[PDB]
Amino acid sequence: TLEILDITPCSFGGVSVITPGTNTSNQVAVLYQDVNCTEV
């Protein structure tokens, strides 16, 4: 086609939790590093 394209790597990153200690509570939060999370 002789068009020009661009290559950007699809999204990666570490996941990381937020925990207040198990002896305090069991709920955690989860952080996804550098994701514009419209999606999972």
């Binding site: 790597p9 990666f12 990153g13 590093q33 550098d34």
Partner: peptide, 24 residues
Amino acid sequence: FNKVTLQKFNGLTVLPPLLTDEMI
């Protein structure tokens, strides 16, 4: 700030600082 000369491809990640610049 106007006198300095400060992207990822593969596994490289630049975590942001905990204290932002206006906070400092």
